[PDB]
Design a protein around this nucleic acid. Structure first.
Ligand SMILES: [Mg+2]
Ligand SMILES: [Mg+2]
Ligand SMILES: [Mg+2]
Ligand SMILES: [Mg+2]
Ligand SMILES: [Zn+2]
Lengths: 267, 129, 102, 225, 64
RNA sequence: CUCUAACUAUAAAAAUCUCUCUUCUC
């Protein structure tokens, strides 16, 4: 029971960019289904099909696959779509490819949710997806902040709480990303004692490791020491590793040696 | 003189993507620049007469909205060094502006004709389509 | 073999003539081998005069005409049907096509 | 209709409810002093509109200005000079033909003569004027062309230059326009040239205003009520 | 705004088109006896039929 | 045996080609 379109209104809009699964081709193109809005079909017309000249009709369509699309005039009376494929900007295709995949994942999760709860998708998107899209602009960003922050479900009225529990479990299992921020610090020392200073630096860099983020400067060479961190929020590893670099500098400036940075902390 | 507040439509009709652009008598104040490529999708048909009717009808609607009732016409080809000949579409735009309510008078052509200068683009042997 | 006794140029006693660009393909051609048509037309087509006639201020307006010559390279003149590929004994007839309507 | 890239490198309003209307007045020289309307952005201090209006020029046919149709091919450009509030004046800025009449006169088998001259008015209005004449086929001519000699052309150009210089240097530009509208200089040129060569369709063209002394408030007031 | 108009053909202006399967005719509107317009037609017509035009003023020309 | 008025509006791409040449006298 797959239904319940991705965005606010059932019908396409003015100059909107979508994507289409194609099934059938009669004479003037293909009146074929959508999977960005409900499940309605639309005309792709041959004069407005491809950039090159239309040499073949079978190759460029690829029945049963995903394709770019733009709607010109929406038949907001009965459910018809006039649709285009040629006039989508090269930068526009890829950004819609995002929007489309963005929309698809939320449905992929809430499908599993409905099929396991046998509640029609319409009610689930009504109760959950639409308030999330209203609050955060995208249900995908709402899901990501749900992984981080629990307060995303406050102000929402699920049809049942077990839906929330299983959705949270499935999102923590499937939508799990902890980005590895890594850096390299070059020891350019020529000084008196360097290995004791390095041990002190490693201890002072490793005792700082928190419960959630643990920093281990691993060895791959003498000058080049590698700093690996698991940034849970993609914004704390930077400050951790900057503090680490400051502490390395505090170490090196007085024993006699010198060190330099080769790569700073990067995601 | 029954208070026909006047305008100048100034259709510029090229061999592609004609223009309709109604402005005041001095020409300083624009009203509904809206053009030929505004309302057609092919980008090949921008010169087509249908583009002319569509552009003309919407600019006439804006003309009634603002208040202009009577219009003088400045028909202009590309002119200059290019082809001196009015665009295929613009004539249809003239017809539409005649039709849709607007009163018309004082038809003029203002195609810029040069006095033989600015060597025309194309080389000696010219376009060799 | 000399195709045309008049050499197909119409210069005949001038040395050299200034060139003029073709109107379609912009090929420069001597201003005499520069097949040329008086494109005189009413600014509005006769098919649409009536709409103008009964929906216009200035009762009995002039309805002016637009004037311009057209200069073609002979390639365009032949392809765009301005000039036909006539027969031999019919080449030496220079009178225009019998005043199209009279 | 789309195919956009929007290389940009909604606070929308109704830009025409925020606008005023103003009247146009022609000088006392012509018959119908009223010209028409003009839309203007609303006059606010710090860019008062009356600053913007002074300098506007409007191209108007002489047929409307005179009612008659024989002035159809003429064309006068009037410059906005004085603003009175909801109503503004105009002074003469230039004269010209409709291109279509010019082309209708320009025919084959009759050479055209042009006379160009820069002349200073009686008051200060530094002008440039042009004159166009065509040889006239005689009343009995079987000769298929009506060409004029080069010497005849030189003499005719000199005559027309002298007549134009006289007419402009006589009177002020207000009186000059009052001479222009009856096109009396045309009959004068034909008078002084009909002995040399017939010269059909003599016409004074492209009266171009180049310089103006300061403002001349009083005369402008005299030209409008 | 459904201006479905009717025009009785008053004269047939030959047959055009690369296929040759289209016919251009002069049609005079059933109402407004004044106006006539030239338009294309697909399928056989003879002097007196009533073309059902959605659109009125799109006067097409000879077609290649 | 009296005369000089009409008019429109197309172009994408297409390379190459192995033989075998043979009488007119009544
Ligand atoms: Mg070719
Ligand atoms: Mg010699
Ligand atoms: Mg020739
Ligand atoms: Mg090979
Ligand atoms: Zn050419």
């Amino acid at each position: 029971t797959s239904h319940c379109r991705f965005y606010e209104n059932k019908y396409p809009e003015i100059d909107d960019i979508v994507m289409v699964n194609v099934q059938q081709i009669a004479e003037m193109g293909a009146y074929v289904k959508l999977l960005e809005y409900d499940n309605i079909e639309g005309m792709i017309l041959l004069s407005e099909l491809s950039r090159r000249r239309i040499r073949s009709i079978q190759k460029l369509i690829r029945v049963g696959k995903n394709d770019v699309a733009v709607v010109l005039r929406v038949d907001k009376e009965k459910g018809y779509i006039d649709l285009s494929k040629r006039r989508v900007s090269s930068e526009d295709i890829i950004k819609c490819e995002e929007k489309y995949q963005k929309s698809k994942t939320v449905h992929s999760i809430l499908r599993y949710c409905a099929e396991k709860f046998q509640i029609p998708l319409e009610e689930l998107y009504k109760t959950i997806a639409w308030p999330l899209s209203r609050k955060f602009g995208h249900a995908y960003e709402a899901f990501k902040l749900s992984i981080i922050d629990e307060t995303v479900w406050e102000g929402i009225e699920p049809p049942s709480k077990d839906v929330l529990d299983e959705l949270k479990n499935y999102i923590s299992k499937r939508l799990t990303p902890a980005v590895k921020i890594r850096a390299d610090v070059e020891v350019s020392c020529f000084s008196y004692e360097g290995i004791d200073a390095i041990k002190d630096a490693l201890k002072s860099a490793e005792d700082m490791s928190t419960e959630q983020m643990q920093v281990k400067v691993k060895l791959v060479a003498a000058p080049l020491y590698v700093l690996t961190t698991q940034a849970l929020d993609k914004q704390k590893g930077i400050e951790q590793l900057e503090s680490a670099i400051e502490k390395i500098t505090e170490v090196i400036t007085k024993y006699g040696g010198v060190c330099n940075i080769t790569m700073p902390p990067k995601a | 003189d029954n208070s026909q507040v006047f305008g100048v439509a100034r259709i510029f009709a090229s061999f592609n993507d004609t223009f309709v652009h109604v402005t005041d008598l001095s020409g300083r104040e624009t009203i509904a620049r809206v053009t030929g490529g505004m309302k057609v999708k092919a980008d090949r048909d921008e010169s087509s007469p249908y583009a002319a009717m569509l552009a003309a009808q919407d600019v006439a609607a804006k003309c009634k909205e603002v208040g202009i009732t009577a219009v003088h016409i400045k028909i202009r080809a590309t002119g200059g060094t290019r082809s001196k000949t009015p665009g295929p579409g613009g004539q249809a735009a003239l017809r539409a502006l005649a039709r849709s309510g607007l009163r018309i008078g004082r038809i003029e052509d203002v195609t810029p004709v040069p006095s033989d200068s600015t060597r025309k683009k194309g080389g000696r042997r010219g376009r060799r389509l | 073999p000399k195709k045309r006794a008049s050499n197909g140029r119409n210069k005949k006693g001038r040395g050299h003539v200034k060139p003029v660009r073709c109107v379609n393909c912009s090929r420069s051609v001597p201003k005499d081998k520069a097949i040329k048509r008086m494109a005189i037309r009413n600014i509005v087509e006769a098919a649409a005069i009536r709409d103008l006639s009964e929906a216009s201020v200035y009762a009995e307006y002039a309805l002016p005409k637009t004037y311009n010559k057209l200069h073609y390279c002979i390639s365009c003149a032949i392809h765009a049907r301005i000039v036909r590929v006539r027969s031999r004994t019919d080449r030496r007839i220079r009178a225009p096509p019998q005043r199209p309507r009279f | 209709a789309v195919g956009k890239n929007k290389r940009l490198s909604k606070r929308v309003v109704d830009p025409f409810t925020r606008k005023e209307w103003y009247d146009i007045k022609a000088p006392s020289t012509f018959e119908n002093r009223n010209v028409g309307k003009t839309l203007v952005n609303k006059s606010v201090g710090l860019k008062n509109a009356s600053d913007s209006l002074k300098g506007r020029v409007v191209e108007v046919c002489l047929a409307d200005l005179q009612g008659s149709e024989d002035h159809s091919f003429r064309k006068v450009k009037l410059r906005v000079d004085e603003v009175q509030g909801k109503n503004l004046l105009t002074n003469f800025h230039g004269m010209d033909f409709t291109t279509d009449k010019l082309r209708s006169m320009v025919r084959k088998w009759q050479t055209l003569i042009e006379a160009n001259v820069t002349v200073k008015t009686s008051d200060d209005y530094v002008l440039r004027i042009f004159a166009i004449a065509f040889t006239r086929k005689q009343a009995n001519q079987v000769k298929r062309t009506s060409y004029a000699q080069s010497s005849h052309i030189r003499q005719i150009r000199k005559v027309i230059s002298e007549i134009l210089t006289r007419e402009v240097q006589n009177s002020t530009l207000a009186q000059l326009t009052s001479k222009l509208i009856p096109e009396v200089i045309n009959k004068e040129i034909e008078n002084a040239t009909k002995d040399i060569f017939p010269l059909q369709n003599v016409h004074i063209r492209k009266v171009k205003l180049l310089k103006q002394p300061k403002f001349d408030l009083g005369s402008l007031l005299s030209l409008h009520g | 705004k459904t201006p479905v108009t009717l025009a009785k053909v008053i004269k047939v202006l030959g047959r055009t088109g690369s296929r040759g399967g289209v016919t251009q005719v002069r049609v005079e509107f059933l109402e407004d006896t004044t106006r006539t317009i030239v338009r294309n037609v697909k399928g056989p017509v003879r002097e007196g039929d009533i073309l059902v035009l959605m659109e009125s003023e799109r006067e097409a020309r000879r077609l290649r």
